[PDB]
Amino acid sequence: AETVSFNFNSFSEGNPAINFQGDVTVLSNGNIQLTNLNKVNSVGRVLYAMPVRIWSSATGNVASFLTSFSFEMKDIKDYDPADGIIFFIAPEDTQIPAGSIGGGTLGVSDTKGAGHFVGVEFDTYSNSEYNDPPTDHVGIDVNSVDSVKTVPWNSVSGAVVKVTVIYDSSTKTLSVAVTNDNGDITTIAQVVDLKAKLPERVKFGFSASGSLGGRQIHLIRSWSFTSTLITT
């Protein structure tokens, strides 16, 4: 049994376990702000530095993982609250798409909304070009921001949101539980074969994006993670 686990209650620059890409910034209170409020088409991403082996070709086993994180999104004057945050899994060479337009691409896909990642988005802006539902929502993304599945959700400015994700290797089920500020929970599950959509070694992280008129504060507050792969 090969297990990877870490726990972040706050973050600090210089920590060799976290990689910053784009407009990412660490505030004085240890929180991570993903986008820069003064940039058009801002994109910020934070990844756990070490790649995690989610499956072995030698045994054909896929890993199971449990992870929880909390974030906060807050409105700012004049700009439209957009675009959202996405928790993703991508190949180890993952980088911000060249000529990224930000916005509804959430910093992980091209203009068509395509890319190489699996993820869970917290979408706060309805992009008709990517078939977004008409309300804020949570969706499961498999190589595209045109979600494979979505559930109505509500983003509340300033509210701390808690998320718990469980990926069960056997059934290949990815389950998500979002605990809203007011106590109500939102859930969504989708069968995704990680061994067929991603390489043996991947990277986990968070990404957020904005546009010219759509900008908001995107904060990643804490993050704990554990993956366990059977080796037999």
Ligand X SMILES: OC[C@H]1O[C@@H](O[C@H]2[C@H](O)[C@@H](O)[C@@H](O)O[C@@H]2CO)[C@H](O)[C@@H](O)[C@H]1O
Residue 147 binds to Ca ion (criterion: CB under 5 A) = no
CA distances 129 to 85, 132, 146, Å, are 18, 8, 9
Separation between Cα atoms, residue 157 and residue 98, nearest integer Å = 30
Size of the site for Ca ion (CB under 5 A): 5
Q: Which residue is nearest to ligand X (CB)?
A: 214
> Is residue 156 involved in binding its own copies (CB under 8 A)?
no
Q: How far apart are the first and last CA of the chain?
A: 8
Binding range to Mn ion, per CB under 5 A, among 31-39, 57-65, 116-124, 186-194: 116-124
Binding site for ligand X (CB under 6 A): 80, 82-83, 103-104, 125, 127, 211-214
Radius of gyration of the CA atoms of the chain, in A: 17
Based on the shown chain and the rule CB under 8 A, indicate whether residue 134 belongs to the binding site for its own copies.
no
Nearest CB to its own copies, comparing residues 21 and 226? 226
Given Ca ion, Mn ion, ligand X, none, residue 117, with its beta carbon under 5 to 8 Å by kind, binds: none
Confirm or reject binding of residue 19 to its own copies (CB under 8 A): no
Residues 6+ apart with CB under 8 A from 175: 165, 166, 167, 168, 187, 188, 189
168 contacts its own copies (rule: CB under 8 A): yes
Among 40, 135, 173, 212, which residue sits at the site for its own copies (rule: CB under 8 A)? Answer: 173
Q: Under rule CB under 5 A, which residues in 75-134 are in contact with Ca ion?
A: 104, 123, 125, 127, 132
> Which stretches of the chain bind Mn ion, using CB under 5 A?
123, 132, 139, 147
> Which stretches of the chain bind Ca ion, using CB under 5 A?
104, 123, 125, 127, 132
